[PDB]
Curated annotation (Swiss-Prot), chain B:
InterPro entries with a match to the protein in the record: ALB/AFP/VDB, Serum_albumin-like, Serum_albumin/AFP/Afamin, Serum_albumin_CS, Serum_albumin_N
Record-listed Phosphoserine modification sites: S3, S56, S63, S270, S414, S484
Albumin domain residues: 1-183, 184-374, 375-569
Repeat found in the keyword field: yes
Pfam family, one: Serum_albumin
Keyword set includes Repeat: yes
The protein's name in its UniProt record: Albumin
Organism, as annotated: Bos taurus
Length: 580, 576
């Protein structure tokens, strides 16, 4: 009768406290760590009270009710967060959707530069708080981070500091490990955000479809009804995470991990290795598991979904069940496809049935449906065949630079900091993907774009300025990459007026770290194309060069500032000659 | 009435009271977080209020050290953070406080602070006072001997720069110049107070007293010696109290002195009226840096009263310090141009000379006045050679020259001290050498005593060189000559070669400009430790070849990676 007692019992105090802490850090992103801790314990103490006495006053409230009551006691709330304190005026579930809406997906908080020595002492100073501070720093930065998975990563973090803090040159031991891990974490955020976006913007069934695709690939051996059960459970888990119900999300995720291990036979043979780890490690392992072998001799899809005479009758009888079935069959025997394409394929199959089952001889129309699809599979490979195999010549950094011009021309109205962050990430696919077996590029890249493109839609949808982008993001989820790739620059676009401040540079530029410097450098490329929408392709190879030669002189010459002072106006006036 | 904490709370009013208390904690517990110290200021501030209501309430009669220290001893994280410092709680006052003082870090190795005008302007308008307190905290924790009342004043100026400049468009361009100039005034100010503190601690009260007789007699040459004696004792008490952590009383006593001074401008100075009409902190600041009043018209020659006279040794033996002060009084009022360091040096000899009045005293001590003014003319050459030295090389080149000279003198000294010191010396070139040549000698004499003190104070903790200890401990007045006299000593056995010292990374390119120099000057230091007898011409070849390294590389990882080992072996061939 007490949701909070139940969750404290099911998860135990340590995890309970971490999740609860993750919750605050994700709602109240600009609040300080020591405060949120203050808020975690009393809620923990309170939870202890209702497990002792479950009929005590208030332990029968929902966790949203109880958690939200805490947020609404935050002294600095309207002062720190403003309009968010309006949320406190509402009733559940409205209060919580209001709070959710104020989650900053671009909290513009300070990048964490880790000094191995100053960190390792804190680690040994206090382990558990070290772990907590980790949960906090990542969650505030990714307000939709998959919670139980964040706990897993905090654990992994300590072990890296646990086992690399007894060294001489710690720093040489650490940085590589923590750089690799934070890459995994970035990805993990991007995925969960996509799962969140599908639900909010395309409804539950969009995410179900996605889950069907993923699981049917990994467990091609399992029966469709088995796969369905995993889908609803897993969807509920994500629906819960994406709504802030972290304790319930975590608890349910654990319950799902068990069911899966308890039923390996009907599901997969590659499970035997995961289902023998501790809970967090187990679930991560299950999520990353290798796909099982496809079953032996199976009827072609054409049989049950095209040639058969009763498809419209079967489809009309239970549309979603029937479509899920199609997605099941298609995916289990095609691990090579990206789940993104599979959805694209099923979305198509649905539209034709809608069309054809309405015509006079519906079977005449649909019999050919596998002729339209078998093309949708071919469309993507080419768009992989011109680029990563474009990519080798330019290399990565060059490639990103190639992309900024292309996308900026596509959608110039987009905020610069967005184009930069995005454009960078698209280029990073090559190092990410195109090194892979040429066979598995397509799932990898189509799967990464769906992540990067989502990031774009989520940044844009708040401060919306470009209709083409709204169109591509909003129209469909499966077709976002096609909608965006299909984009062309509009001669309607009126070029951005010149602002010296954009093209002016200071000694700070040299005193920058290597990467951020690129962004500060890449930002300017962005501004030019906004300024000169119809610029050409080779002067850029010269205009950047005078620039790369510019920064070197100044970073070289003695008076670190003076060159910038006199050199700087020169490049603009030269490059402003070359503007035509 | 019988409660010191009531007494100070009434005398200063709550706002100064709270800042000063925060300064104290911030100076004792330098590595503790700002909000923690805040919690401690209030608890003590509420308690303080209780004793003004009821002065007979329990504990209101305890000393401030009892009360402040009892608070230091409730900190849960004290031994974990500070180690032996938690031993201090086991002691009784006054031993507990002398123990806490001993753990004050003069080199707290805290993060250099880069102010981002947006982030700061956000904080400032957000909350004025916590912004104000946070300044007090960051400065105090970095200078645990900072002159407290003066620190409050600077907090005020900090906020005023933010009342302005933040209501602006390009905030950063309005701000950065202002906070940067002030950051110099504060740094200087710290070095001074660190000096006044060290004089007392290591040379006693009268040492601090002699300076003051000089400093004040210059400023108020109109005042009679007795008035000055009155000011001197008052002011010495002020600094003794600050230097001992007795901040509330320091502030309270300083104010009272500022008041007294305004009430007697007539008997003291004509240049006071512009100060004596400001708010309290500003007033005190202004009085301190006020312009020297004009010397009165025609007064007796010095030779007259201190030599030709028949009772010079006998009057002297009757009251040594008083008579010696009179000398310091009289000599100083008529030499506004001289450096206080020089006047003490002069007084120090005259004392050394006075110690000859021991068969026919009148005969020996008649020639003393030609000996002194030799001491004034002595310094002048090392100012031309250094200022002409500096003029040629520029600052940065000059600092590098200094780094080499001193690394030669005292190789055992820690690398970071040598670097920190030489730099500040080089800035003397820019600080003084620009002035009209007539007045170059005093200004240069004045900053050195500050910088040289900073060396003794850093070394005095982890003492590794017999040479500096001798000079730091010998005398306060003669520290400047002492150091000049030492020459690199063949006793020194060169430091074994360590590649870790001379390897370079891409960070060297990405550094702010200031650290950039420090990493190189650091590298330069370590070389002379390795090769003491390198020559005055090879090094510029090593530096020429060296700056001819970063230019190529500044890969980014691979060249440094191979270039660096190449340069190491180059400098290692031509090293002889
Ligand atoms: C999104 C991620 C997850 O939310 O964990 C995922 C992806 C693919 C398969 C599974 C899965 O089957 C699973 C179920 C229970 C616990 C762990 C993994 C999970
Ligand atoms: C050390 C500094 C100071 O302690 O402020 C200083 C220098 C010179 C003169 C005075 C002074 O006479 C004074 C007295 C009362 C309040 C303010 C200044 C003070
Ligand atoms: Ca933002
Ligand atoms: Ca429920
Ligand atoms: Ca130190
Ligand atoms: Ca006292």
């Amino acid at each position: 009768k007490s949701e909070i007692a139940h969750r404290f019992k099911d998860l135990g105090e340590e995890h309970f406290k971490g999740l609860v802490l993750i919750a605050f850090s994700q709602y109240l992103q600009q609040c300080p760590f020591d405060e949120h801790v203050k808020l975690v314990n009393e809620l923990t103490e309170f939870a202890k009270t209702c497990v002792a006495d479950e009929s005590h006053a208030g332990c029968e409230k929902s966790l949203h009710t109880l958690f939200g009551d805490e947020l609404c006691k935050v002294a600095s709330l309207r002062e720190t967060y403003g309009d968010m304190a309006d949320c406190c005026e509402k009733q559940e579930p409205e209060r919580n959707e209001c709070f959710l809406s104020h989650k900053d997906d671009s909290p513009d908080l300070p990048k964490l530069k880790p000094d191995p020595n100053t960190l390792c002492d804190e680690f040994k100073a206090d382990e558990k708080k070290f772990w907590g501070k980790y949960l906090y720093e990542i969650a505030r930065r990714h307000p939709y981070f998959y919670a139980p998975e964040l706990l897993y990563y905090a654990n992994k973090y300590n072990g890296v500091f646990q086992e690399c803090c007894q060294a001489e040159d710690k720093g040489a031991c650490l940085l590589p490990k923590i750089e690799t891990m934070r890459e995994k974490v970035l990805a993990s955020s991007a995925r969960q955000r996509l799962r969140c976006a599908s639900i909010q913007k395309f409804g539950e069934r969009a995410l179900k479809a996605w889950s069907v695709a993923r699981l049917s690939q990994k467990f091609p051996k399992a029966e469709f009804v088995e796969v369905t059960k995993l889908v609803t459970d897993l969807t509920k888990v994500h629906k819960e995470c994406c709504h802030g119900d972290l304790l319930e999300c975590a608890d349910d995720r654990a319950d799902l991990a068990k069911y899966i291990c308890d039923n390996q036979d009907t599901i997969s043979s590659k499970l035997k290795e995961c289902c023998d780890k501790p809970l967090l490690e187990k679930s991560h392992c299950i999520a990353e598991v290798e796909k099982d072998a496809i079953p032996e001799n199976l009827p072609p899809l054409t049989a049950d979904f095209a040639e058969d005479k009763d498809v419209c009758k079967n489809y009309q009888e239970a549309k979603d069940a029937f479509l899920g079935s199609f997605l099941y069959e298609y995916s289990r025997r095609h691990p090579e496809y990206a789940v993104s394409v599979l959805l694209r394929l099923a979305k198509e199959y649905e539209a034709t049935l809608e069309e054809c089952c309405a015509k006079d001889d519906p079977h005449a129309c649909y019999s050919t449906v596998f002729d339209k699809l078998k093309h949708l599979v071919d469309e993507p490979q080419n768009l992989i065949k011109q680029n990563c195999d474009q990519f080798e010549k330019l290399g990565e950094y060059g490639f990103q630079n190639a992309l900024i011009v292309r996308y900026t021309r596509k959608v110039p109205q987009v905020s610069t900091p967005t184009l930069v962050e995005v454009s960078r990430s698209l280029g990073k696919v090559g190092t990410r993907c195109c090194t892979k077996p040429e066979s598995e590029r397509m799932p990898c890249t189509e799967d990464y774009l769906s992540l990067i493109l989502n990031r774009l839609c989520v940044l844009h949808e708040k401060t919306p300025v470009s209709e083409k982008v709204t169109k591509c993001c909003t129209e469909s989820l499966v077709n976002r990459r096609p909608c965006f790739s299909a984009l062309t620059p509009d001669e309607t676009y009126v070029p951005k007026a010149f602002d010296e401040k954009l093209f002016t540079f200071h000694a700070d530029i040299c005193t920058l770290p290597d990467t951020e410097k690129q962004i500060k450098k890449q930002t300017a490329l962005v501004e030019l194309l906004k300024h000169k929408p119809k610029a050409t392709e080779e002067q850029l190879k010269t205009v950047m060069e005078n620039f790369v030669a510019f920064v070197d002189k100044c970073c070289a010459a003695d008076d670190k500032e003076a060159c910038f002072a006199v050199e700087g106006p020169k490049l603009v006036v030269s490059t402003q000659t070359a503007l035509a």
